[PDB]
Amino acid sequence: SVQIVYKPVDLSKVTSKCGSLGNIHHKPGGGQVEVKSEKLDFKDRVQSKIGSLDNITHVPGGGNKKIETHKLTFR
Amino acid sequence: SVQIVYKPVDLSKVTSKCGSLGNIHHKPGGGQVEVKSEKLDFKDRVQSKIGSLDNITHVPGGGNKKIETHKLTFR
Amino acid sequence: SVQIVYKPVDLSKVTSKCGSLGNIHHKPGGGQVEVKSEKLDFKDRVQSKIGSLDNITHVPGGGNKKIETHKLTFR
Amino acid sequence: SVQIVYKPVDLSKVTSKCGSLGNIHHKPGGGQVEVKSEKLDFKDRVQSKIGSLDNITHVPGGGNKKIETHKLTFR
Amino acid sequence: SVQIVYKPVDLSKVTSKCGSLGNIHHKPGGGQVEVKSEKLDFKDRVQSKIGSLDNITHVPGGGNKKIETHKLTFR
Amino acid sequence: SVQIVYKPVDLSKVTSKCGSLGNIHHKPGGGQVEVKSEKLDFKDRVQSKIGSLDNITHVPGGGNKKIETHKLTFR
Numbered sequence: 525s526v527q528i529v530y531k532p533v534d535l536s537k538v539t540s541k542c543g544s545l546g547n548i549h550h551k552p553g554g555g556q557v558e559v560k561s562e563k564l565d566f567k568d569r570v571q572s573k574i575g576s577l578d579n580i581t582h583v584p585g586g587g588n589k590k591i592e593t594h595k596l597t598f599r
Numbered sequence: 600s601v602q603i604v605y606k607p608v609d610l611s612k613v614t615s616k617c618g619s620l621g622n623i624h625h626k627p628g629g630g631q632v633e634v635k636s637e638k639l640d641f642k643d644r645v646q647s648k649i650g651s652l653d654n655i656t657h658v659p660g661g662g663n664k665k666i667e668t669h670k671l672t673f674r
Numbered sequence: 675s676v677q678i679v680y681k682p683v684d685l686s687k688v689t690s691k692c693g694s695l696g697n698i699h700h701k702p703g704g705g706q707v708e709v710k711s712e713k714l715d716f717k718d719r720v721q722s723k724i725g726s727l728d729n730i731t732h733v734p735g736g737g738n739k740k741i742e743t744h745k746l747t748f749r
Numbered sequence: 750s751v752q753i754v755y756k757p758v759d760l761s762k763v764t765s766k767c768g769s770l771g772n773i774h775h776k777p778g779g780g781q782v783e784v785k786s787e788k789l790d791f792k793d794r795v796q797s798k799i800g801s802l803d804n805i806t807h808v809p810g811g812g813n814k815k816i817e818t819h820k821l822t823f824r
Numbered sequence: 825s826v827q828i829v830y831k832p833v834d835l836s837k838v839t840s841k842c843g844s845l846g847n848i849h850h851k852p853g854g855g856q857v858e859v860k861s862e863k864l865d866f867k868d869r870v871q872s873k874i875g876s877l878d879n880i881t882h883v884p885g886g887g888n889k890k891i892e893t894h895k896l897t898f899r
Numbered sequence: 900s901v902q903i904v905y906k907p908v909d910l911s912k913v914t915s916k917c918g919s920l921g922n923i924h925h926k927p928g929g930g931q932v933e934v935k936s937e938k939l940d941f942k943d944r945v946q947s948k949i950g951s952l953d954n955i956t957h958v959p960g961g962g963n964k965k966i967e968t969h970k971l972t973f974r
Contacts, residue, residue: 528603536611547622554630571646576630578653584660586617594669603678611686619694629705638713651705652727659735661692668743751901752827761836761911767961772922773848779855780929780951787937788863797947801855803878809885810959811842816891822972
């Protein structure tokens with residue numbers, strides 16, 4: 525005779541928490557910002573940001589991947 | 600006789616929490632922003648952002664992928 | 675005689691929470707923004723944003739993908 | 750604000766296996782039984798079993814009882 | 825605001841297996857039974873069984889009882 | 900604010916295995932049984948078993964009882 529019993533139990537967490545979670549920003553203040561630009565010459569791409577208070581979150585990561593194989597073979 | 604019993608149980612979580620979650624921004628102030636530009640000369644692409652208070656979240660990530668394979672081969 | 679019983683149970687979650695969730699922005703203030711421009715010259719594409727208080731969420735990510743494969747082969 | 754989330758999960762077994770299970774009785778032999786009775790006198794109830802091979806299972810027990818009570822009272 | 829979410833999940837088993845299950849009785853032999861009776865005298869109820877091979881299952885038990893009570897009371 | 904989350908998970912077994920499970924009785928032999936009774940006198944109940952090979956399982960027990968009470972009271 526043969527009896528095979530296959531009863532794995534999984535309660536696992538795979539988890540990510542990414543970027544800005546649960547912060548307190550109590551009354552922050554950006555200063556006065558002044559930009560004067562005169563006679564400038566640009567021969568290639570200009571990428572520009574000007575500002576007093578910038579708050580930025582960027583998240584290319586924080587992804588999750590679970591691979592799970594349950595192979596059983598008899599004879 | 601042969602008896603095969605295949606009863607795996609899954610309660611697993613795959614989970615992501617990405618970007619800006621549960622933050623408090625209590626009364627943040629952007630300051631005055633002044634930009635003066637004069638006689639400038641751009642020969643290729645200009646990309647520009649000007650502002651007092653910028654609050655940006657960007658999330659290319661945080662994706663999830665579960666691959667699950669149950670296989671039973673008899674003779 | 676042969677008996678095969680195939681009773682897998684799944685209660686698993688695949689889940690994503692992406693972008694800006696459950697934040698409090700209590701009375702945020704953008705400052706005055708002034709942009710003055712004179713005699714400028716652009717010879718290729720100009721992309722511009724001007725504003726006092728910008729509140730941006732962008733989410734190319736946060737997707738979910740479950741592949742599940744049950745196979746039972748007899749003789 | 751109030752949020753109540755009530756998500757109990759039950760996969761429990763209550764199980765009983767009672768009496769004679771999965772036994773092998775390979776070629777059991779009862780012997781010859783002879784009962785001779787003479788001039789006997791019974792003034793009240795007679796209950797009798799006579800036999801060579803008796804194979805008896807009796808199960809007043811093995812019962813199961815699940816009482817389950819979920820209660821949520823608000824104000 | 826008030827939000828109540830009531831999502832209990834049940835997959836529980838209540839189960840009984842009573843009496844004679846899955847036994848093998850390979851070629852059992854009852855022997856010769858002889859009962860000889862003379863001049864006997866019974867003044868109240870006679871209950872009798874005579875036989876070579878008796879194979880009895882009796883099950884007053886093995887019953888199952890699930891009581892399940894969900895209650896949600898608001899104000 | 901109030902948030903109450905009630906997520907208990909149960910995978911418990913309550914289990915009983917009672918009486919005769921998984922025995923091997925390889926070729927047991929009952930002997931010859933002879934009873935001679937003469938001139939006996941019974942003034943009250945007679946209960947009798949005569950036999951060569953008696954193989955008895957009796958199970959009043961082996962019962963199971965799960966009482967489960969989930970209660971959540973708010974104000």
